[PDB]
Amino acid sequence: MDVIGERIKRIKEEHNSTWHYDDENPYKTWAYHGSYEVSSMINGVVKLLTKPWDVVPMVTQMAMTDTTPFGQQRVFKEKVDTRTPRPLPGTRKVMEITAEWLWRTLGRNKRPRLCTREEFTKKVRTNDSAKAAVEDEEFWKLVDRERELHKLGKCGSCVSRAIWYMWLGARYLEFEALGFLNEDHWFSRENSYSGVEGEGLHKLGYILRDISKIPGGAMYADDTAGWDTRITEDDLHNEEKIIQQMDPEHRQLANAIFKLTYQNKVVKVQRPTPTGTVMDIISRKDQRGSGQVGTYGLNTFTNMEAQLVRQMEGEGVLTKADLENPHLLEKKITQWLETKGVERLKRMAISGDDCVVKPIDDRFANALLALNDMGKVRKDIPQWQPSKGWHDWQQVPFCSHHFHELIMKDGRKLVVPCRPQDELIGRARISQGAGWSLRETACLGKAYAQMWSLMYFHRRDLRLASNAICSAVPVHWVPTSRTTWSIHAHHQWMTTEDMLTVWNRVWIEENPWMEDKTPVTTWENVPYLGKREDQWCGSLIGLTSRATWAQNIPTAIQQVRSLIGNEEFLDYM
């Protein structure tokens, strides 16, 4: 294979001392070529201040970390090492027509452009190995060299200083060609109608409530089993249509990414070995390359398209006969898209593989012919069982959360993000990597505490625990390291600014859904969930262990203080 050849030869050239061809490889659908070579600690600060949760199963589970070449073969040989059957001719036709219409819609006000070394550098600097590479001129010279191959329609290194530079160089070139989708906010709600990119977690609830006001059926939120593994060759070809909107120099580079890396990927992966440790080189045409720039945008695009197709089927626009038809007429599809398409996009909230859809009625529930045929088979449900919808938007799962409407004492309403409390406490009690001092650990603890104060203040236990952590950690210490990798996090808690000031800014001043801008002057006027709701979402309020914890908290705070030492502390209790 000419397209894949050069990349194989370069890894083989460097790792020639232990290169061997294996006749016994677990890969059944991934093309085999060869093989060479022949985690996280507990946050003591958060732990000491959340004693009742020492005896909680979810908290214990999350503390178990197995990022190993042993817990890697289980992930790969589950959903990744499979094939998706080709969609029917009619299905392919509908998808193509819809993709063309969607790209035109998405590009109505924006024009694609190349992203830059300066942009990528800024991104890397705003969070060590990638930092050094970015500051190195030799890295950008290698970038330049690889780009020249791409312009000739060849790929050299896009898949130990050599391999690290090759990896980040590949990521930069992806960013250069397809980064505009994120950087120029193509999937913002204003631009995409269905999208929520850049909106923020603090807005997602309001967005779902707005969807709930649109006349129609129930709200549906079906999970797809292993979305990235269900991206077909046809999906890839539909996603590629964005290149039609590019200038020649950009089109050339994006073409290379789509053809050479997206539709012809080379992947390095390890597997169990009785001899030692081996990393295998494999290739594939379809599926989403999960660790590639542009993945989020392209998933969002293809999910938007898929859900429109499902809506069409629900509405009777598409029949079983249509999907089977190799000569399907475009007329009715184009008519639906031109007259109803934007309206139907507005009925959805879509983030990558995650969707919420409020169709015009409930035929959608059993409209499954296209969804299954497109390869987007729903998780943990028989293929032909109707989807269960929610009549209450506050029950709809989206982006690992659900959302509650709260009433404030002054009569104003807030819509807030929520999730099982054990998940929040379980995450906060984990520190990323090992070898951290008490200061660094305390500072990450502070970051979680302040995230709770801004996003999850309505949870009684979390506000108490947050107040406890912030009391135990020196006031002038700046939160470090991230609390989450979520693309919906805006990290407003990464500051030493007063939390009530930040709370007012987010929830009142800059909140588009808050008409009355009257500031909240005390935390006592910042509302909680109803006690019943708090309990349903995992609160320990009402339990003796929790009451004991609440009474004994000042003691635990002072213990952490004595171990930190003579610093400036403030009481938030």
Beta bridge pairs of residue 367: none
* Strands of 201-298, DSSP E: 265-271, 278-284
User: Is the Cβ of residue 202 or residue 288 nearer to Cl ion in the bound state?
Assistant: 288
Both tokens of 369, joined, read: 């012919």
Residues in the interface with Mg ion (CB under 5 A) total 2
In a 3-state reduction of DSSP, which class is residue 313?
helix
Residue 80 vs 418, nearer CB to Zn ion: 418
Cα distances (angstroms) measured from residue 434 to each of 22, 54, 93, 441, 446: 36, 21, 52, 10, 18
- Which residue sits closest to Cl ion, CB atoms considered? 297
CB of 295 to Mg ion, least distance (A): 17
The option from Zn ion, Mg ion, Cl ion, none interacting with 474 (CB < 5 to 8 A, set by class) reads: none
140 binds Cl ion (CB under 5 A): no
Q: Which stretch binds Mg ion (CB under 5 A): 116-124, 346-354, 500-508, 529-537?
A: 346-354
Piece of the chain touching Mg ion by CB under 5 A; list 259-267, 353-361, 362-370, 517-525: 353-361
List, in sequence order, every beta strand (DSSP E) within 37-99: 41-42
Residues 208-227 that bind Mg ion (CB under 5 A): 221
Counting residues that bind Cl ion (by CB under 5 A) gives: 5
Q: Which does 182 bind (CB under 5 to 8 A by kind): Zn ion, Cl ion, Mg ion, none?
A: Cl ion
Determine whether the annotation assigns residue 537 to a binding site: yes
Work out the number of other CB atoms within 10 angstroms of the CB of residue 67. 9
Instruction: Give the residue, chosen from 106, 155, 219, 306, that forms a contact with Zn ion under the rule CB under 5 A.
Output: 155
Both tokens of 418, joined, read 């929520």
| String of contacts with Zn ion for each residue 531-550, x by CB under 5 A | ------x-------------
Answer positive or negative: Cα dihedral of 15, 18, 20, 26: negative
For the CA atoms of 445, 451, 454, 455, what is the dihedral angle to 10 degrees? -140
User: Closest distance between Mg ion and the C-beta of residue 157, in Å?
Assistant: 36
Q: Apex CA 30: angle with CA 29 and CA 36, to 5°?
A: 145
DSSP 8-state assignment for residue 434 = S
Length of the chain: 573
- 205 is in the binding site of which of Mg ion, Zn ion, Cl ion, none (Cβ under 5 to 8 A by kind)? none
Question: Inter-axis angle of helices 137-151 and 161-178, to 10 degrees?
Answer: 60
HSE-up (13 A, CA, CB side) for residue 255: 15
The DSSP H or E segment spanning 36 is strand 31-36
Q: What is the CA radius of gyration of the chain?
A: 26
* 221 contact choice in Cl ion, Zn ion, Mg ion, none (CB below 5 to 8 Å, kind-dependent): Mg ion
* Complex with Cl ion: residue 32 or 296, whichever CB lies closer: 296
Nearer to Mg ion, 286 or 354 (CB): 354
283 vs 302, which CB is nearer to Cl ion? Answer: 302
Q: Which of 177, 418, 444, 469 binds Zn ion (CB under 5 A)?
A: 418
Q: Is the dihedral of CA 146, 148, 150, 154 positive or negative?
A: negative
Helix, strand, coil shares, percent, the chain, to 5: 50, 10, 40
State yes or no: 158 annotated in a binding site: yes
Subset of 252-311 contacting Cl ion (CB under 5 A): 294, 296-297
296 binds, among Cl ion, Mg ion, Zn ion, none (CB under 5 to 8 A by kind): Cl ion
Which positions touch Zn ion (CB under 5 A)?
A: 155, 158, 418, 537
Q: Binding site for Zn(2+), residues?
A: 146, 150, 155, 158, 402, 418, 537
Q: What is the binding site for Mg ion (CB under 5 A)?
A: 221, 354
Note the residues at the interface with Cl ion (CB under 5 A). 181-182, 294, 296-297
Binding residues: 146, 150, 155, 158, 402, 418, 537
